[PDB]
């Protein structure tokens, strides 16, 4: 099906505790494959998935040089942001960036992304046209004016439509045994009384990849959206994910409830119920 590559950059100032830290991670879909941390003993871009390890020294040296230069540019950007927001040199601040490309099932570029944030709030985003910007506030409008004058969007577009897609396709091929394999959830319903007249039904999904999943409870065939406790999808640590959805139901009515599971690794959506032993 569809696939994406995304890089996530975090730059964090820390006055009195040295220069700002820069961390970068790269993902294909929900699989991390590279990392960089300026606080490492010897900062280098490092492999985090087995299928990237085959890349040669030119790859690793080039990515490391890029990340080091990026760290330096973000240190400058943190200083500039102080001027844009009338802020003092004593506070700690964070710039974040996420960017990359999505391919559709056919393998063509579906769309590109490049968004940045300051202190956890939208700052500036490249529009879907890969040609214009959306600035979140008057500071980001200064950046937008600079980037328009310097034709930065054209550079981003060339990367997103070119290198980003070409390298994502390479990674998908080199990692095809895992990146192009969906693992369907293992599912079951548990039952736990809360009292004599109510019980929790919890619908579990375990061991699935990729992370996108839909778990829903129905009562008499009607979705229980506002009555369902849904935990955030969470990583197991073996590449797969876990999730559960729970409802509190009147005792004796358990059989009126059905859990519905949608996942890319399933041929059809599943319906499950509590199965008393």
């Amino acid at each position: 099906g569809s696939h994406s590559m995304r890089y996530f950059y975090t730059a964090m100032s820390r006055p009195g505790r040295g220069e700002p830290r820069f961390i970068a991670v790269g993902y294909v879909d929900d699989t991390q494959f590279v990392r960089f941390d300026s606080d490492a003993a010897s900062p280098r871009t490092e492999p985090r998935a087995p299928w990237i390890e085959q890349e040669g020294p030119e790859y690793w040296d080039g990515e490391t040089r890029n990340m080091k230069a990026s760290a330096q540019t973000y240190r400058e950007n943190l200083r500039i942001a102080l001027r844009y927001y009338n802020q003092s040199e004593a506070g700690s601040h964070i710039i974040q960036r996420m960017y990359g490309c999505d391919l559709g099932p056919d393998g063509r570029l579906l769309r590109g992304h490049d968004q940045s944030a300051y202190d956890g709030k939208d700052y500036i985003a490249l529009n879907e046209d890969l040609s214009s910007w959306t600035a979140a506030d008057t500071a980001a409008q200064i950046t937008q004016r600079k980037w328009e004058a310097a034709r930065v969007a054209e550079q981003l577009r060339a990367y997103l439509e070119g290198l980003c897609v070409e390298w994502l396709r390479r990674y998908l091929e080199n990692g095809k045994e895992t990146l192009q394999r969906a693992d369907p959830p293992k599912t079951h319903v548990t039952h736990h009384p809360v009292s004599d007249h109510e019980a929790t039904l919890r619908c579990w999904a375990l061991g699935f990849y990729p992370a996108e999943i839909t778990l829903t409870w129905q009562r008499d065939g009607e979705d229980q959206t506002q009555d369902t406790e849904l935990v955030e999808t969470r990583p197991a640590g073996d590449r797969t994910f876990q999730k559960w959805a729970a409802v509190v139901v009147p005792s004796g009515e358990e059989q009126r409830y059905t859990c519905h599971v949608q996942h890319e690794g399933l041929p059809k959506p599943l319906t499950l119920r509590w199965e008393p032993s």
Binding site: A24, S70, T73, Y123, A150, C164
Partner: peptide
């Protein structure tokens, strides 16, 4: 493969 960073 990573892209480039410019000044804000």
């Amino acid at each position: 493969k990573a892209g480039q960073v410019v000044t804000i």
